[PDB]
Design an enzyme around this catalytic site. Structure first.
Site, PDB file in Angstrom:
ATOM      1  N   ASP B  25       8.961   4.177 -28.804  1.00 56.99           N
ATOM      2  CA  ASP B  25       7.957   4.028 -27.739  1.00 56.99           C
ATOM      3  C   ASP B  25       8.598   3.820 -26.371  1.00 56.99           C
ATOM      4  O   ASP B  25       8.897   2.688 -25.975  1.00 56.99           O
ATOM      5  CB  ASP B  25       7.052   2.835 -28.074  1.00 56.99           C
ATOM      6  CG  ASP B  25       5.801   2.625 -27.296  1.00 56.99           C
ATOM      7  OD1 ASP B  25       5.693   3.375 -26.258  1.00 56.99           O
ATOM      8  OD2 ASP B  25       4.943   1.798 -27.579  1.00 56.99           O
ATOM      9  N   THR B  26       8.782   4.901 -25.615  1.00 55.06           N
ATOM     10  CA  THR B  26       9.407   4.808 -24.311  1.00 55.06           C
ATOM     11  C   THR B  26       8.543   4.062 -23.302  1.00 55.06           C
ATOM     12  O   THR B  26       9.047   3.658 -22.269  1.00 55.06           O
ATOM     13  CB  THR B  26       9.787   6.163 -23.784  1.00 55.06           C
ATOM     14  OG1 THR B  26       8.611   7.008 -23.694  1.00 55.06           O
ATOM     15  CG2 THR B  26      10.798   6.874 -24.675  1.00 55.06           C
ATOM     16  N   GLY B  27       7.236   3.906 -23.585  1.00 58.99           N
ATOM     17  CA  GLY B  27       6.327   3.173 -22.736  1.00 58.99           C
ATOM     18  C   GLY B  27       6.267   1.681 -22.982  1.00 58.99           C
ATOM     19  O   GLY B  27       5.428   0.987 -22.385  1.00 58.99           O
TER      20      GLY B  27
HETATM   21  C1  LIG Z   1      -4.827   7.718 -27.969  1.00 56.35           C
HETATM   22  O1  LIG Z   1      -3.969   7.677 -26.836  1.00 56.35           O
HETATM   23  C2  LIG Z   1      -3.445   6.427 -26.595  1.00 56.35           C
HETATM   24  C3  LIG Z   1      -2.637   6.359 -25.433  1.00 56.35           C
HETATM   25  C4  LIG Z   1      -1.985   5.194 -25.126  1.00 56.35           C
HETATM   26  C5  LIG Z   1      -2.195   4.057 -25.881  1.00 56.35           C
HETATM   27  S1  LIG Z   1      -1.326   2.586 -25.533  1.00 56.35           S
HETATM   28  O2  LIG Z   1      -1.053   2.550 -24.118  1.00 56.35           O
HETATM   29  O3  LIG Z   1      -2.083   1.500 -26.147  1.00 56.35           O
HETATM   30  N1  LIG Z   1       0.136   2.633 -26.313  1.00 56.35           N
HETATM   31  C6  LIG Z   1       0.094   2.843 -27.759  1.00 56.35           C
HETATM   32  C7  LIG Z   1       1.082   2.013 -28.555  1.00 56.35           C
HETATM   33  C8  LIG Z   1       0.843   0.540 -28.326  1.00 56.35           C
HETATM   34  C9  LIG Z   1       0.991   2.377 -30.051  1.00 56.35           C
HETATM   35  C10 LIG Z   1       1.266   3.239 -25.607  1.00 56.35           C
HETATM   36  C11 LIG Z   1       2.330   2.219 -25.243  1.00 56.35           C
HETATM   37  O4  LIG Z   1       3.531   2.864 -24.833  1.00 56.35           O
HETATM   38  C12 LIG Z   1       1.896   1.220 -24.165  1.00 56.35           C
HETATM   39  C13 LIG Z   1       1.774   1.826 -22.769  1.00 56.35           C
HETATM   40  C14 LIG Z   1       1.354   0.760 -21.769  1.00 56.35           C
HETATM   41  C15 LIG Z   1       2.293   0.210 -20.880  1.00 56.35           C
HETATM   42  C16 LIG Z   1       1.895  -0.859 -20.057  1.00 56.35           C
HETATM   43  C17 LIG Z   1       0.649  -1.401 -20.091  1.00 56.35           C
HETATM   44  C18 LIG Z   1      -0.281  -0.826 -20.965  1.00 56.35           C
HETATM   45  C19 LIG Z   1       0.050   0.223 -21.792  1.00 56.35           C
HETATM   46  N2  LIG Z   1       2.864   0.128 -24.106  1.00 56.35           N
HETATM   47  C20 LIG Z   1       2.651  -1.072 -24.628  1.00 56.35           C
HETATM   48  O5  LIG Z   1       1.675  -1.346 -25.374  1.00 56.35           O
HETATM   49  C21 LIG Z   1       3.695  -2.129 -24.311  1.00 56.35           C
HETATM   50  C22 LIG Z   1       4.200  -2.904 -25.349  1.00 56.35           C
HETATM   51  C23 LIG Z   1       5.182  -3.873 -25.054  1.00 56.35           C
HETATM   52  C24 LIG Z   1       5.720  -4.712 -26.211  1.00 56.35           C
HETATM   53  C25 LIG Z   1       5.620  -4.018 -23.756  1.00 56.35           C
HETATM   54  C26 LIG Z   1       5.043  -3.277 -22.732  1.00 56.35           C
HETATM   55  C27 LIG Z   1       5.525  -3.395 -21.292  1.00 56.35           C
HETATM   56  O6  LIG Z   1       6.676  -3.040 -21.077  1.00 56.35           O
HETATM   57  N3  LIG Z   1       4.758  -3.820 -20.318  1.00 56.35           N
HETATM   58  C28 LIG Z   1       3.393  -4.352 -20.568  1.00 56.35           C
HETATM   59  C29 LIG Z   1       5.156  -3.684 -18.870  1.00 56.35           C
HETATM   60  C30 LIG Z   1       4.134  -3.071 -17.908  1.00 56.35           C
HETATM   61  N4  LIG Z   1       3.094  -3.777 -17.395  1.00 56.35           N
HETATM   62  C31 LIG Z   1       2.420  -3.010 -16.580  1.00 56.35           C
HETATM   63  C32 LIG Z   1       1.130  -3.321 -15.847  1.00 56.35           C
HETATM   64  O7  LIG Z   1       2.919  -1.750 -16.606  1.00 56.35           O
HETATM   65  C33 LIG Z   1       3.976  -1.782 -17.490  1.00 56.35           C
HETATM   66  C34 LIG Z   1       4.841  -0.538 -17.612  1.00 56.35           C
HETATM   67  C35 LIG Z   1       4.125  -2.278 -23.012  1.00 56.35           C
HETATM   68  C36 LIG Z   1      -3.098   4.101 -26.939  1.00 56.35           C
HETATM   69  C37 LIG Z   1      -3.746   5.280 -27.287  1.00 56.35           C
END
Ligand SMILES: COc1ccc(S(=O)(=O)N(CC(C)C)C[C@@H](O)[C@H](Cc2ccccc2)NC(=O)c2cc(C)cc(C(=O)N(C)Cc3nc(C)oc3C)c2)cc1
Ligand SMILES: [Cl-]
Ligand SMILES: [Cl-]
Ligand SMILES: [Cl-]
Ligand code: NA
Ligand code: NA
Ligand code: NA
Lengths: 99, 99
Positions: B25-27
Site C-alpha cells: 500500500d503506497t498510500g
Molecule cells: C474502492 O476504492 C477505495 C479507494 C481507497 C480506499 S482507502 O483510502 O480507504 N485505502 C484502502 C486501504 C485502507 C485498504 C487506501 C489507502 O492507501 C489509504 C489512503 C489514504 C491516505 C490518507 C488518508 C486517507 C486515505 N491509506 C490509509 O488508510 C493509511 C493507513 C495508514 C496506516 C497510514 C496512513 C497515512 O499515512 N496517513 C493517514 C497520512 C495522511 N494523512 C492525510 C490527511 O493524508 C495522508 C497522506 C494512511 C478505499 C476504497
C-alpha cells in the site's frame, strides 16, 4: 519515472480542468477525489477503509492527466482526506511496483 | 518482482512464525496488521484513514518477512479491512513505483 517511497508518492493531476495533488496509491482499488463538480451522470456509492465508510458520487468515463499521462476511467468524488489515484487508473499509465 | 496493478497487490508475509496475506500500500505511511500477539511493549498511535480515526498499538523493531524479503521495523496492530504494508516497510524491501 521511478518514484521513490521514501516520501509519499504525490503527483500533479489535471481533472475537470483543475490541477490537484494526488497520491499514487496501490492500496486503493478506485480513484477518489475531494469534492468537485464533474460533467455527466453519477450514482452513489459507499467505499470503506480504515475508520469506516464514506459516501461518494461515482462518475464513469472521466479523463485525468496523471503526471503528464492521460487515462480514462471511473472517478469517485466525496469527502476523502486526500486525493487518491487508485489501481483503476494506475494500470492505464503502466504503473508497477518493483523490488 | 515487477508487480502490475490489474489485481490487488497481495503478498504473503511472515510475522511471529505465521503466514498472513497483506496488501502492498503506497498510500500508507505505516504498516497495519489485524489483531495478533506481538512481543514487547507497545505505544499508542492514532491513524486517520478514509473513514475516520482509529487507535492502534504500535510495536517497534518487529521482525517481518514480506514476499520473501526480510524487514525489521514498526508494526501497528488494530482493526483494518485488510493487512497493509506501508512505506516504512516498502522502503526496507527496496520497493519503488515505476511508469
Ligand atoms: C474502492 O476504492 C477505495 C479507494 C481507497 C480506499 S482507502 O483510502 O480507504 N485505502 C484502502 C486501504 C485502507 C485498504 C487506501 C489507502 O492507501 C489509504 C489512503 C489514504 C491516505 C490518507 C488518508 C486517507 C486515505 N491509506 C490509509 O488508510 C493509511 C493507513 C495508514 C496506516 C497510514 C496512513 C497515512 O499515512 N496517513 C493517514 C497520512 C495522511 N494523512 C492525510 C490527511 O493524508 C495522508 C497522506 C494512511 C478505499 C476504497
Ligand atoms: Cl475504471
Ligand atoms: Cl500491463
Ligand atoms: Cl519502521
Ligand atoms: Na460519465
Ligand atoms: Na499482546
Ligand atoms: Na518492540
Amino acid at each position: 519515472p521511478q518514484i521513490t517511497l521514501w516520501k509519499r508518492p504525490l503527483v500533479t493531476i489535471k481533472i475537470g480542468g483543475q490541477l490537484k495533488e494526488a497520491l499514487l496509491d496501490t492500496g486503493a482499488d478506485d480513484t477518489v477525489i475531494e469534492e468537485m463538480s464533474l460533467p455527466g451522470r453519477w450514482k452513489p456509492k459507499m467505499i470503506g477503509g480504515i475508520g469506516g465508510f464514506i459516501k461518494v458520487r461515482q462518475y464513469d468515463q472521466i479523463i485525468i492527466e496523471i503526471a503528464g499521462h492521460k487515462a480514462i476511467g471511473t472517478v469517485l468524488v466525496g469527502p476523502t482526506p486526500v486525493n487518491i489515484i487508485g489501481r483503476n487508473l494506475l494500470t492505464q499509465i503502466g504503473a508497477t511496483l518493483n523490488f
